[PDB]
Swiss-Prot record:
This is Histone-lysine N-methyltransferase NSD3. Residues 5-68 form the PWWP domain. The KIKL motif recognizes and binds the NET domain of BRD3. The lineage of its organism: Eukaryota, Metazoa, Chordata, Craniata, Vertebrata. Interacts with BRD4. Interacts (via KIKL motif) with BRD3 (via NET domain). Histone methyltransferase. Preferentially dimethylates 'Lys-4' and 'Lys-27' of histone H3 forming H3K4me2 and H3K27me2. H3 'Lys-4' methylation represents a specific tag for epigenetic transcriptional activation, while 'Lys-27' is a mark for transcriptional repression. It comes from Homo sapiens (Human). Highly expressed in brain, heart and skeletal muscle. Expressed at lower level in liver and lung.
Amino acid sequence: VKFQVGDLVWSKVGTYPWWPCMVSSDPQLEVHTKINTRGAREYHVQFFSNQPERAWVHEKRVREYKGHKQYEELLAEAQKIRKPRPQRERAQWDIGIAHAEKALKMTREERIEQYTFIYIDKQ
Ligand SMILES: Cn1cnc(-c2ccccc2)c1-c1ccncc1
């Protein structure tokens, strides 16, 4: 384990770009980290966005979030070739970054209080 609840991280999931997240405890498993069915470590994250969502992410797809300007360094990990940025997606990413920049100014306990999602079971 390298991340704990309330840590700010970037996650690279599915078809999405590196995205600002907060590590959190899964509402059902009550753990923020686990070993998956392939034997690899995963972390439970919340995506910062206008659309609240969560996911289990392979440790190789998680990075410490030091600030929004780190995005360039993450693209460097992979003429220069750049993927274009789709409009709706860029708008949600900018919202997520604005929240992550606000969260970076808080303590870990403050972030946990401000951002941990409330989960409501389908009735
Ligand atoms: C970056 N990202 C990777 N997966 C998701 C996602 C997960 C489950 C359902 C839907 C999307 C998102 C995302 C989440 C919220 N806002 C923007 C992107």
